[PDB]
C-alpha cells in the first residue's frame, strides 16, 4: 500500500550491484505488483556474486 | 556463462610503453560501456578511463591525460586501452567493468554500478 519510485534507486550510481531477474530495471516503474520484500543486510564483497 | 577477461599486463620499463586487453565471452560486450579500474598498493580504487558503448564518448583521469587512450572494436568484441609514458605512479592492478548508463547525458564523466567485472591484470612500472 505504497508507491514505488524505483528511479531514485536505479539512477542514484550510488549501489555497487544492480542484478535484475525476470524484470528489466528500466520497467520498474511500469509493472506493479501485490506485494514487494525487502531484506537488507551487510555482507562481504567476494560473497555479494 | 558472462565473462570478461583482461590481458596484456607485465613488468615495463618507467616511459615505456604497455597495451591492455579486455575480451567479453559469452555477450555482446558493444551494448555496454566498459571503463579501466585500477588499485595501487595502499589506495583505493580509482577510475582510469571509461568509453561510451558505440565510442562517441570517452573519460580519462586527470593523472593520465596525455598518455593513455582508450578505444574498443565493437565486431571484435574487445575494448583496449594503451599506456604510454608510464610511470611508478601507475603499478597497480587494473580491471576493466561493463556497465549501463544509470544517469541521464551521453558522457561518461560520472561513476555509477558497475554490472560485470573481471579478474584483473598487474602492470608493474620500476626502473
Known amino acids: 500500500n505504497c508507491v514505488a519510485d524505483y528511479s531514485v534507486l536505479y539512477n542514484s550510481a550510488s549501489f555497487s550491484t544492480f542484478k535484475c531477474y525476470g524484470v528489466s530495471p528500466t520497467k520498474l516503474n511500469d509493472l506493479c505488483f501485490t506485494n514487494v520484500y525487502a531484506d537488507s543486510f551487510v555482507i562481504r564483497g567476494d560473497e555479494v556474486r | 556463462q558472462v565473462q570478461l577477461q583482461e590481458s596484456g599486463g607485465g613488468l615495463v620499463q618507467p616511459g615505456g610503453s604497455l597495451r591492455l586487453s579486455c575480451a567479453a565471452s559469452?555477450?555482446?560486450?558493444?551494448?555496454?560501456?566498459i571503463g579501466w579500474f585500477r588499485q595501487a598498493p595502499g589506495k583505493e580504487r580509482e577510475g582510469v578511463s571509461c568509453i561510451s558503448s558505440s565510442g562517441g564518448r570517452t573519460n580519462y583521469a586527470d593523472s593520465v591525460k596525455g598518455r593513455f587512450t582508450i578505444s574498443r572494436d565493437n565486431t571484435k568484441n574487445t575494448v583496449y586501452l594503451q599506456m604510454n609514458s608510464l610511470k611508478p605512479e601507475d603499478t597497480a592492478v587494473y580491471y576493466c567493468?561493463?556497465?549501463?548508463?544509470?544517469?541521464?547525458?551521453?558522457?561518461?564523466?560520472?561513476?555509477?554500478?558497475?554490472?560485470?567485472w573481471g579478474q584483473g591484470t598487474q602492470v608493474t612500472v620500476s626502473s
Open positions: 559469452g555477450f555482446t560486450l558493444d551494448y555496454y560501456a
Open positions: 567493468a561493463a556497465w549501463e548508463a544509470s544517469r541521464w547525458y551521453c558522457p561518461l564523466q560520472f561513476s555509477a554500478d558497475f554490472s560485470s
